[PDB]
Write a protein that binds this ligand. Structure first.
Ligand SMILES: *C(=O)CCCC[C@@H]1SC[C@@H]2NC(=O)N[C@@H]21
Ligand SMILES: O=C([O-])CC(=O)C(=O)O
Ligand SMILES: [Mg+2]
Ligand SMILES: [Mn+2]
Lengths: 541, 77
């Protein structure tokens, strides 16, 4: 293990870290530890552990204050630091988060891009991160982002594989599952919601928000569509209705109107998630709080704003003398934020540089988590200086696709198509004329084949026939057309490849990301557990 | 080594990356709508299909080495 550690240190010292400039390792002082005034309170995690998920729902319904979900550990660093936040810093502050802020409804620390990114770039197992954080935070409810039938991947998976992931993740410590479909299709969500209910955890059925409900010129996603979707999601027995504003498109007037209309539609508590990209995130949460939203998603101030969540410390003072307060220890949250400000300086190579709010997001509707990666993807392909060009193409491709809901994995499809169009200098009537000779990206082809489900209003018929030439097109759930994976045969071949008997979490990781998990195991054999190094040593040797 | 733009014989990639595996041998039959080679990005796959009905004469890239945007992958006659 010392040999592997010295091997990694020498490799990074000599050849640099992949994907960043081989800069000098700056001397960092130790991050500031919080000084906390601890109050022993009963949390929602305790209610779930003792009385169950329905009692957590009743406790949320009986809370007059708005509850807070901390997205610092997943979404804040996904939006700002390209998901590169390492378990070392999280474990530096995890106990202080669990004790100093027991008023949090949950902490979003898993799922989304973290599962892919930890394995691929950080060379640490997300299951290991979940275990370490679960040990460090026993009284904090753990929330994960689950992309329905797409799981933590970008493609459809069979239903038994989804159920196995939900079982293993619930056993490992995930308590709240935020389940969403990229195209807001209920059949993609039903099996995941049922599996979460069967595992005794909290199922959050999510409505992805797009467009403007207060704009009469855009009637595709109006208020009646969202109300019907909410009623259908309430029929599935999900515990909490979630509303994902992934690009920060929910205006505060719309936020009041949408939440109030959802409250008289369904009896579920409403969990609102938005990004502060337009700069209106705080006033959107204020509008939803006046409308009676139950839980909102906030981040610590040093990792908030921009494409990330609205600030947890800011939302306290925004609601400080209103009818509803935010349920948080604001003095403990400010002390915890001192740590997060210090460790953010470690991730300077991954800084987006997004210094200003953009109201242009109301036009292109790029999700906050996709803002950095789509720009970095243009840099790798050589059009990174043309980001505003691909942002305009992102608007056009969404219109060509039929004004779809853009969120992972559907936003990746629009991002890949927009990058492919600019790289080849294509335009809208050009793909309609020359698309037969053109070779579209695999994500675009699979999306029009139906791998991501059926969009609202269906695909455009002419564009679909151009994009998929002779491949089979399905009109139903892609999970019905996925072969059931036998976990015994997968465990046998994985043991042969990695040299030891894998766990249930390791078998599931091999099904989610076969090449990525195998590449992670090879680096583990070469460099060992590099997650134990601090971030400047991990990044600069 | 630059693939000519305009004539669909000289096909190429779209994004820089690495060709993983070349399913087709050198200079054999190709049917319209058949995967020949995979191109790559950091997190984006592309199985380039057959532009028409034809056959290769010579192959330009091998297993695993880096490729560029527009670079010559297969010239298929
Ligand atoms: C790999 O480069 C990191 C993840 C890239 C995809 C992520 S997942 C969440 C964001 N949404 C999206 O469509 N792409 C982003
Ligand atoms: O990027 C988004 O808006 C959705 C997201 O976080 C994910 O599913 O990984
Ligand atoms: Mg309440
Ligand atoms: Mn988000």
């Amino acid at each position: 293990r010392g040999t592997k550690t010295l091997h990694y240190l020498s490799m990074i010292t000599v050849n640099g870290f992949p994907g960043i400039e081989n800069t000098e390792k700056r001397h960092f002082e130790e991050p500031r530890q919080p000084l906390l005034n601890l109050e022993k309170k009963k949390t929602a995690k305790n209610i779930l552990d003792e009385q169950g998920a329905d009692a957590v729902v009743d406790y949320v319904k009986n809370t007059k204050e708005v509850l807070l979900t901390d997205t610092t550990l997943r979404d804040a660093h996904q939006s700002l630091l390209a998901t590169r936040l390492r378990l070392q810093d999280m474990k530096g502050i995890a106990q202080a988060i669990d004790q100093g802020l027991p008023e949090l409804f949950s902490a979003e620390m898993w799922g989304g891009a973290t599962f892919d990114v930890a394995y691929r770039f950080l060379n640490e197992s997300p299951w290991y991160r979940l275990r370490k954080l679960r040990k460090l935070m026993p009284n904090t409810m753990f929330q994960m982002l689950f992309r329905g039938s797409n799981a933590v991947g970008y493609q459809n998976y069979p239903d038994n594989v989804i159920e196995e992931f939900i079982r293993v993740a619930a056993h490992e410590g995930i308590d709240v599952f935020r389940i969403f479909d990229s195209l807001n299709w209920l059949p993609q969500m039903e099996k995941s919601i049922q599996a979460v209910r069967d595992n005794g955890k909290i199922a959050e059925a999510t409505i992805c928000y797009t467009g403007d409900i207060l704009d009469p010129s855009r009637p595709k996603y109006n208020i009646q569509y969202y109300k019907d979707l909410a009623k259908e999601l309430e029929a599935t027995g999900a515990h909490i209705l979630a509303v994902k504003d992934m690009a920060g498109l929910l205006k505060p007037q719309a936020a009041y109107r949408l939440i109030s209309e959802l409250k008289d539609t369904v009896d579920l508590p409403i969990h609102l998630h938005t990004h502060d990209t337009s700069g209106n995130g705080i006033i959107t949460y204020s509008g939803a709080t006046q409308a009676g939203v139950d839980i909102i998603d906030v981040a610590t101030a040093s990792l908030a704003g921009g494409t990330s969540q609205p600030s947890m410390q800011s939302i306290y003072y925004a609601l400080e003398h209103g009818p509803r307060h935010a349920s948080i220890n604001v003095k403990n949250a400010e002390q915890i934020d001192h740590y997060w400000e210090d460790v953010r300086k470690y991730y300077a190579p991954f800084e987006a540089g997004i210094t200003s709010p953009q109201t242009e997001v109301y036009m292109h509707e790029m999700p906050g988590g996709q803002y950095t990666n789509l720009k970095s993807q243009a840099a790798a392909v050589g059009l990174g200086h043309r980001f505003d060009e691909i942002k305009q193409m992102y608007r056009k491709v969404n219109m060509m696709f039929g004004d779809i809901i853009k969120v992972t994995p559907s936003s990746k499809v629009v991002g890949d198509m927009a990058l492919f169009m600019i790289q080849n200098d294509l335009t809208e009537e050009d793909v309609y004329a020359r698309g037969n000779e053109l070779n579209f990206p695999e994500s675009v082809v699979s999306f029009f084949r139906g791998d991501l489900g059926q969009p609202v209003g269906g695909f455009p018929e002419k564009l679909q026939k151009i994009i998929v030439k002779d491949k089979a097109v399905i009109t139903d759930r892609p999970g019905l057309h996925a072969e059931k994976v036998d976990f015994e045969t997968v465990k046998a071949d994985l043991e042969q490849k990695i040299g030891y008997e894998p766990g249930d979490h390791e078998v599931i990781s091999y099904i989610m990301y076969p090449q990525v998990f195998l590449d992670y195991q090879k680096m583990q054999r070469e460099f060992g557990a590099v997650t134990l190094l601090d971030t400047p040593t991990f990044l600069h040797g």
